[PDB]
Amino acid sequence: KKELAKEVIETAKKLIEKLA
Amino acid sequence: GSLREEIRKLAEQLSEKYKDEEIRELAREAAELAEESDDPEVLELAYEALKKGLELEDEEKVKLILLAAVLAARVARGEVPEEKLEIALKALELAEASEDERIIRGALRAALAAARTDDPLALEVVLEALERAQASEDERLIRAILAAAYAFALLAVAGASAERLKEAEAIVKELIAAAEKGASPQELVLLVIEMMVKGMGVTMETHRSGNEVKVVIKGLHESQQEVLLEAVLFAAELMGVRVRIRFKGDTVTIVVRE
């Protein structure tokens, strides 16, 4: 779960940078 | 520390900049979820998203940025079912990989709505739908799947019973199978309408005067109409179909344009 949560946060940051 | 102060400041600033109630709600939710978590990584995520919302002027991009941040913060705060994490991850991967803004917004909206529910039945249906979309390289089919998943997830957060979600699951599977075989976008939009009608426990009549199908929906409370509209209008945009929606007293009429 901890590994999935870190991957979710990492992917969300990449998406936000793309959207910006 | 300094991030916590800035997150609260930015959320208030975002609420002054943008009049749209959804940005104001998501900005407030990001601040709340960031505080409820003790993860620094969630704090930097919320800070980064709120800051970009202030640097940008396009409401649409800002909405999507806040949707991503709230989704991630909701599933990373505390300990959630593994299915919720997998839903968020696969939606975020679908959004990051696509150039079509409709897929980004469909993935985020379906996953955040699923993240709000606690029913394991609802989580497995949304996850299974996102698994199918990730396996496909057809962005047209992906948009059909996301339209079905978002409609279903909206039924779940609108309080549909487990029994009505089991019937809605069947329609989700029917819609995906039909889309894979090449059904018209109009046929798929009718399936979303049927899903919402049965899921909200109301009734409908279908009339095919000529080339254009008309659905008449009866029995919805006025404040329940918004759920059906959001599901149908969103599905119609995702699958490239125009609908005309007219209202009487308790009656909603939807013409699916061909």
Author numbering:
A (entry chain B): 4 to 23
B (entry chain A): 0 to 257
Mind quoting what the paper says about this structure?
Several natural systems exhibit ‘facilitated dissociation’, in which an effector (E) can bind to a target–host (TH) complex to form an excited ternary complex (THE)20–26 from which the target dissociates quickly. We set out to design protein systems that undergo facilitated dissociation. We use a switchable target binder (host) and a flexible effector that can rapidly bind to and switch the target–host complex to induce a large steric clash with the target, forming a strained excited ternary complex. We show here that by explicitly considering excited intermediate states when designing coupled protein systems, a broad range of facilitated dissociation systems can be designed.
We used X-ray crystallography to structurally characterize multiple states of our designed systems. For both the AS1 and the AS5 systems, the crystal structures of the hosts alone and of the host–effector complexes closely match the design models (maximum 1.3 Å Cα root mean square deviation (RMSD)).
